[PDB]
Amino acid sequence: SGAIYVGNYRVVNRHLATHNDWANLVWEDSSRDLLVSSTTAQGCDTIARCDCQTGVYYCSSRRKHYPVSFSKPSLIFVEASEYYPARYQSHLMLAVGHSEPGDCGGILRCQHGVVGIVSTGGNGLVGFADVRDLLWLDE
Ligand SMILES: CSc1nccnc1CC(=O)N1CCC[C@H](C(N)=O)C1
Ligand SMILES: [Zn+2]
Numbered sequence: 001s002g003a004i005y006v007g008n009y010r011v012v013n014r015h016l017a018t019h020n021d022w023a024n025l026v027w028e029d030s031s032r033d034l035l036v037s038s039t040t041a042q043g044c045d046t047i048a049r050c051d052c053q054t055g056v057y058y059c060s061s062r063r064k065h066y067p068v069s070f071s072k073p074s075l076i077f078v079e080a081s082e083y084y085p086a087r088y089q090s091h092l093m094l095a096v097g098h099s100e101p102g103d104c105g106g107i108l109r110c111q112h113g114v115v116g117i118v119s120t121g122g123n124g125l126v127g128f129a130d131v132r133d134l135l136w137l138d139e
Helices: 019-023
Strands: 004-013 025-029 034-044 054-059 064-069 074-078 087-096 107-110 113-122 125-130
Touching (some): 054 113, 064 087, 087 113
Antiparallel strands (some): 004 034, 025 034, 054 064, 074 087, 087 125, 107 113
């Protein structure tokens, strides 16, 4: 679990969104596993606007942050699950690192701010749904 709070927005994994998230929906993309909902309270996370390929992510299944090198946002095939059939997930970045299903929502950050959130994993790999292209999160 976990979310990004920026301005009057809350960014979560779309497969983990609540009824509240859906009742206050701003935008969602099943292909990116992202959903943004509106909040009344003001959020203070800074979104990075960069092409960084190194950062630190939070791994709740280990209660630790880990430094990682990660690939460029791209279309990566993701196995069928209880939330989605077998498909390509766009805007996904992979890194060698530990993750488990409860790890989705952990933030990935570089020196510039929030890069994205844990969205996929398996076999010593961890996938992050990128948010740096969502320029509207700041306006
Ligand atoms: C950190 S998630 C994880 N980690 C290890 C093993 N398995 C997983 C599970 C996993 O990847 N998914 C299940 C939830 C929906 C995800 C998606 N974005 O389509 C795919
Ligand atoms: Zn950066």
